[PDB]
Structure formats: structure tokens, C-alpha cells
């Protein structure tokens, strides 16, 4: 389901990192493969050349922790109306406490040592389940 | 702007929000509904400095950028029935030492 239309009609888009995370913007290419692009430092914005009907998602460049773009999971550059570039506002999502806790423990603990903590084997698994873009793309294909 | 607060007397901690331009007296009204002591029986401290009722919370340095939902600013409460008690805010628990593998 998830791949960029090769519409061949360009669209001037502003990636606006409105998050404390270093952002990795990810174009879904014509085969539906996630192709990474140059990372945005936090609170910075760049005006980029993309195409209508193309598909974009954004992740933490260091942990692939999932971010939002204009409130939602996926971004599709529309037509620039009045020569006014379209805005991709990349914010942090309201992570669950469990997911935010996981992020923070992962960020401190080397993956090897996850097994070397005093927590239920249920939570080791939750720790090892690093956010994956591919697994998420797979997850999102279904109804 | 909105401001988010822990109003704290001894063990009791109270999470509440208000606007920067709301007053310290409106904050004493909040405690009245909850703890059933009138505003004249209360004394509000910012770090043990007594606060004037007439003053707005933005005047007292409780801004949106200090009193955040994720990191609310503490407000100390003292009750009266002859004189006002010493501010005694009982501290939260001590986090144990980091396991070797988080250091």
C-alpha cells in the first residue's frame, strides 16, 4: 500500500523540527522502501524540493523513536498554492509513560545488559523490541 | 500562559494549574475547597520566602517556562490555631543507587 506516487510534479516543503530530538526524515521510495535523508538538528528548519503524492515519515536519528508530522504519522507534500511552501511540522508525540520509560532505560543500558537487570522477563522483551521503521510499515499495512 | 504546581504541606502534595496573571490568593482559595481551611489560615512560600496575596504568580517567578506540566513548581503551605506553623515539607523518597550497568 505504502509507496510514493511518481507524480513528477514538484512541491516546495519546509521540514520544521519542533522537537528536542535530532530528526531523521524518511522518504518512502517508488518500491515502498524507507530511504533515509540528511538529519535535522533540533529546533532547526530546512526548505526542501520534493514531489506531490510522495510519502514521508520522521524518526529519532539515534533511536528511530517515532515522531509525528502535522499531528499524524505520514506526510504527503500537496500543491504549493500562492507560491507559499507547505509546512511539515515535526513534533514529539505524547509517548505513553511505559514507552518514554523504555526510551530512557534503552538510552542508558547497553543492549547486552538488558538481561542483566532485576525486572520481569516480560519487560526485557519490551526493552529488546527497539522501534523499527520496517516492522512499523508492516504493522500499518492491514485493516 | 498556564502554570502547573505542587502545593505541599508535610505529606500532602496537591497538583493544580492556574494562569500566570492569577493571584496567590486564588491559590489559597484552591487549598480551601480541598483541605477545608480558610485563606486567612494559610501561608504560601516560594522556597521559604513568604508570598503577598495581592501578587500575580508571574510576578512571583511561576511562569509557563518554570511551572510546566512535566516539571511543576513547588508551593509551600503553612497553617495557623494561634500562630503560623514552621514550613515543614516532608521530602519524597530516595532513589536507590544506579545498578552498575546504567553508569
Amino acid at each position: 500500500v505504502l509507496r510514493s506516487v511518481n507524480s513528477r510534479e514538484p512541491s516546495q516543503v519546509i521540514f520544521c523540527n519542533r522537537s528536542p530530538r535530532v530528526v531523521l526524515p524518511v522518504w518512502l521510495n517508488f518500491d515502498g522502501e524507507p530511504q533515509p535523508y540528511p538529519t535535522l538538528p533540533p529546533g532547526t528548519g530546512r526548505r526542501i524540493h520534493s514531489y506531490r503524492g510522495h510519502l514521508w515519515l520522521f524518526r529519532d536519528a539515534g533511536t528511530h523513536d517515532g515522531l509525528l508530522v502535522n499531528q499524524t504519522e505520514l506526510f504527503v507534500p500537496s500543491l504549493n498554492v500562492d507560491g507559499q511552501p507547505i509546512f511539515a511540522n515535526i513534533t514529539l508525540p505524547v509517548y505513553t509513560l511505559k514507552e518514554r520509560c523504555l526510551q530512557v532505560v534503552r538510552s542508558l543500558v547497553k543492549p547486552e545488559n538488558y538481561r542483566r537487570l532485576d525486572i520481569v522477563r516480560s519487560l526485557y522483551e519490551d526493552l529488546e523490541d527497539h522501534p523499527n521503521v520496517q516492522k512499523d510499515l508492516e504493522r500499518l499495512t492491514q485493516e | 500562559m498556564d502554570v502547573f504546581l505542587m502545593i505541599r504541606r508535610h505529606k500532602t502534595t496537591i497538583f493544580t494549574d492556574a494562569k500566570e496573571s492569577s493571584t496567590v490568593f486564588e491559590l489559597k482559595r484552591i487549598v480551601e475547597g480541598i483541605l477545608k481551611r480558610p485563606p486567612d489560615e494559610q501561608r504560601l512560600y516560594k522556597d521559604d520566602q513568604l508570598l503577598d496575596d495581592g501578587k500575580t504568580l508571574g510576578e512571583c517567578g511561576f511562569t509557563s517556562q518554570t511551572a510546566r506540566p512535566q516539571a511543576p513548581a513547588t508551593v509551600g503551605l503553612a497553617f495557623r490555631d494561634d500562630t503560623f506553623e514552621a514550613l515543614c515539607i516532608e521530602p519524597f523518597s530516595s532513589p536507590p543507587e544506579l545498578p552498575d550497568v546504567m553508569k
Binding site: - | 497538583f15 493544580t16 506540566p69
Partner: protein
């Protein structure tokens, strides 16, 4: 504004709006107006009540959303709380 009392393992009485504590299903469950937590200490349950405020404020917000801060020393026990509370 209906409030609720969340007593921790060390007797700390946390008072939070009712509509902020039905963020946690586990609490939503226990209620559906004091609630004791024999296993959750106050240096944790403090931080949980901050999340509650954090979630009610920033969920469905067009505004920039800031990090939820978690200090290394609380991380392992706060995760175990998060999971028990379904939030």
C-alpha cells in the same frame, strides 16, 4: 473540580483532579476516592502524577510538545509503575 487521593508506599497523599487520573486505566478501574499503592514509592508516584498533567495538557495539542524528563535513578522503578498502571 472533583479531586482524588493517591497514597504511596511511604504515606505521601497526592491530590490530583479526577479527570487527570482516568488517564490511567488501572486507576479508572479501581475507581469505576482515596487509592493506596503499597508497592509504589513517592519519588515515583510524584512523577506519575506529573505525566497525568503532561498527557491531559499536550494530547491533541497543535503546540510544540516537550520531552517528558526521567532522571536515570528513577527510570527502572517508574517503568515498572507505568506498566502496572496502563499508561
Amino acid at each position: 473540580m472533583m479531586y482524588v487521593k493517591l497514597i504511596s508506599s511511604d504515606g505521601h497523599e497526592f491530590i490530583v483532579k479526577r479527570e487527570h487520573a482516568l488517564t490511567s486505566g488501572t486507576i479508572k478501574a479501581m475507581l469505576s476516592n482515596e487509592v493506596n499503592f503499597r508497592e509504589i514509592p513517592s519519588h515515583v508516584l510524584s512523577k506519575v502524577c506529573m505525566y497525568f498533567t503532561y498527557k491531559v495538557r499536550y494530547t491533541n495539542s497543535s503546540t510544540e510538545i516537550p520531552e517528558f524528563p526521567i532522571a536515570p535513578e528513577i527510570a527502572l522503578e517508574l517503568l515498572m509503575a507505568a506498566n502496572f498502571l496502563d499508561c
